[PDB]
Structure 1
Amino acid sequence: DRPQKPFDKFFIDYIGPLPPSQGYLYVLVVVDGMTGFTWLYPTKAPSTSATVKSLNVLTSIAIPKVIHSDQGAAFTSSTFAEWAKERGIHLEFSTPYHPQSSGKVERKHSDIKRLLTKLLVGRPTKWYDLLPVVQLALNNTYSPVLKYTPHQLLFGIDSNTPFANQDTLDLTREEELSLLQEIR
């Protein structure tokens, strides 16, 4: 069996609803399987259309052999199937209620949910602008399993923004009480 490579598999997924930000409510999450590299796209809905619009931007840069998702409606639609077929992309679904990825992807996906939550408190409404810096952080984050960041695995070089400051990623007692104020 040939070794895993970038572009072999993109794991795609939606996160939201979120507090409105410049009229956007969701984030399409794309993670490369082999490298753990992550693309984020803001959308207004988890629809086949917003998904196609978004992946059209991504696929003008790199095309995956396989997209893997859960059985969300956007991904199981027959439109989305046509889109994928047009591009020679094989679609892959995880069984209902039993989402499988890889350890790397599950961990990455966790870091995203955690990293977002940390910065959306005190400014639940200004995440749209933060997306670029979120991704930079995520992609310049050191991997325990391999010696290298996703940036290094994708491009074969050091980045010019090394996030040498590993962060708490935990909520401080200030932020915990402030987040329980927003829900109210």
Structure 2
Amino acid sequence: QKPFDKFFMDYIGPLPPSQGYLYVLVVVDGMTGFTWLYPTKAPSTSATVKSLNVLTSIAIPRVIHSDQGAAFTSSTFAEWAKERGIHLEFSTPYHPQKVERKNSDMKRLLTKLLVGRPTKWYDLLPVVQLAMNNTYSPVLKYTPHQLLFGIDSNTPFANQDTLDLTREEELSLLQEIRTSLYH
């Protein structure tokens, strides 16, 4: 298999109103575990399509998996997916999601972090993403960023422990994610 071949996606929220945003679309690459976070106003098809058009400008996935939230089961979303050539796969009573709990724990953690920062979470979201993808996974044996961008690639970060963060609210965020993500 390959990166960008399959995505798992879900909405978290409603979150505390931060700069007018109430939800985050969480999209995870199935192979590398690389996570993209897209803040939105609603868990809607429109916002889902907006976000995924940005993501799928990089590569078009073979498959996307989600639960049956309204955003994902609409005929509009279905038509978007059909046109792009993307097969949609839903969590069904007869379909097998580990494969569910992994996502559940990370989304729980995600929600805790964002709700725990009521008015700043929107501005910190980019730091959350960055921190998650540059955190070592015991399952992977590398970080998701290493797996997407190349293990021995020269990274954008001068300091792999701080990730070139300097602000205290950001550094404590990185500390909290590093110690909670897979434990």
Classify the TM-score, shorter chain: 0.7 to 0.9
Does the 8 Å contact 1:121/1:175 carry over to 2? no
How many aligned residue pairs are there? 178
CA distance in 2 between counterparts of 1:113 and 1:170 reads 25
Change (3 A) 1:146 1:163: farther
Q: TM-score, normalised by structure 2?
A: 0.76
Change (3 A) 1:76 1:158: same
Q: Per-residue deviation at 1:63?
A: 1.6
Change (3 A) 1:128 1:176: closer
Does the 8 Å contact 2:131/2:177 carry over to 1? no
CA distance in 2 between counterparts of 1:132 and 1:178 reads 14
CA distance in 1 between counterparts of 2:72 and 2:93 reads 13
Change (3 A) 1:134 1:181: closer
CA distance in 1 between counterparts of 2:134 and 2:177 reads 32
Q: TM-score, normalised by structure 1?
A: 0.76
Question: In structure 2, the residue corresponding to 1:132 is in which secondary structure?
Answer: helix
Does the 8 Å contact 1:48/1:73 carry over to 2? yes
Q: CA RMSD in A?
A: 6.3
Q: Deviations over 1:130-159 (max 9, x none)?
A: 111101111011111232111111111357
Q: Deviations over 1:90-119 (max 9, x none)?
A: 11011159871xxx7646535543543554
Does the 8 Å contact 1:151/1:158 carry over to 2? no
Structure 1: gaps of 5 or more residues: none
Does the 8 Å contact 2:15/2:114 carry over to 1? no
Question: In structure 1, the residue corresponding to 2:123 is in which secondary structure?
Answer: coil
Q: Deviations over 1:21-56 (max 9, x none)?
A: 110000000000010000000010011111111111
Change (3 A) 1:39 1:159: farther
Q: Which runs of 4+ in 1 moved over 4 A?
A: 96-99, 104-108, 158-184
Q: Per-residue deviation at 1:120?
A: 3.7
Aligned-residue sequence identity (percent) comes to 97
CA distance in 2 between counterparts of 1:157 and 1:129 reads 29
Matched, 1:66 2:60: no
CA distance in 1 between counterparts of 2:106 and 2:175 reads 22
Deviates more, 1:170-179 or 1:34-43: 170-179
Q: Deviations over 1:59-92 (max 9, x none)?
A: 1122211011111111000100110111111110
Does the 8 Å contact 1:12/1:31 carry over to 2? yes
Deviates more, 1:113-122 or 1:42-51: 113-122
Does the 8 Å contact 2:124/2:170 carry over to 1? no
Does the 8 Å contact 1:11/1:30 carry over to 2? yes
